[PDB]
Amino acid sequence: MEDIEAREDIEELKKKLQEFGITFLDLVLNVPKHRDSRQLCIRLAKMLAEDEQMYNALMKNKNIPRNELKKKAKVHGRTIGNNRKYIIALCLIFRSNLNLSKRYLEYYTMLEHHHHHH
Amino acid sequence: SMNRLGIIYEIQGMKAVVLTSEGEFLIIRRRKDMKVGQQVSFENEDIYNVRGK
């Protein structure tokens, strides 16, 4: 009932990040400056987790399947590379026991119901 | 004067890496109510800077 995540699950996520060479500090460095950017980056991570083939490629390569992400997201490879560690983290969250953080990320990315930056 | 709600992902000494309500992993000022895995409602002014260049 309670909306808490377990430290053991948080750090289990971290153990996965350690396999990629990512810390929680790396994530802060890769944090997008504004809303447009972060909705976009978390959305990339979302579709990367939404697809099993992409997620499995991500795990085995320890890097994002950049070409496959680029064809589905229609983003720049430069976007992918700059936010790579960050995108990996959220992707992992959507498929990891971090259901509350999943919920935070999912509700934030669905907020593109009106999204024109002008 | 601006609240951000988030989830605590790591305690790092006197600071903590938390998620914000925008999914940002940001370092804020460590508090009493902090435990890795719990939620925290903090100020945007608790947020540190990594400083980027």
Per DSSP, the residues of B13-30 read TTEEEEE-TTS-EEEEE-
Chain A nearest C-alpha distance from B5 (Å)? 10
- Method used to solve the structure: NMR
Judge: A24–B26 Cβ closer than 8 Å, yes or no: no
Determine how β-strand B25-29 pairs with β-strand B3-12.
Answer: unpaired
Q: Please name the member of B6, B7, B25 whose beta carbon is closest to the beta carbon of A27.
A: B25
Number of domains in chain A: 1
Nearest to A27 by CA among A40, A39, A41: A41
Hey, what amino acid is at B36?
V
Query: Chain B residues with CB inside 8 Å of A3's CB?
Result: 39
Distance (Å, rounded) from C-alpha A61 to C-alpha A39? 25
Residue A117 burial by Cβ neighbours in a 10 Å radius (0-12, 13-18, 19+): exposed
In three-state secondary structure terms, A4 is coil
User: Which residues, in sequence order, are CB contacts of A91 under 8 Å at separation 6+?
Assistant: A45, A46, A48, A49, A55, A58, A64
Spell out the domain ranges in chain B. Answer: 1-53
Element (H, E) at A55: helix A52-61
Q: Which domain holds residue A52?
A: 1-118
The secondary structure of B32-47 as a DSSP string is: TT--TT-EEEEETTSB
| Mutation for testing the B interface, residue in A17, A24, A25 having most B CBs under 10 Å | A24
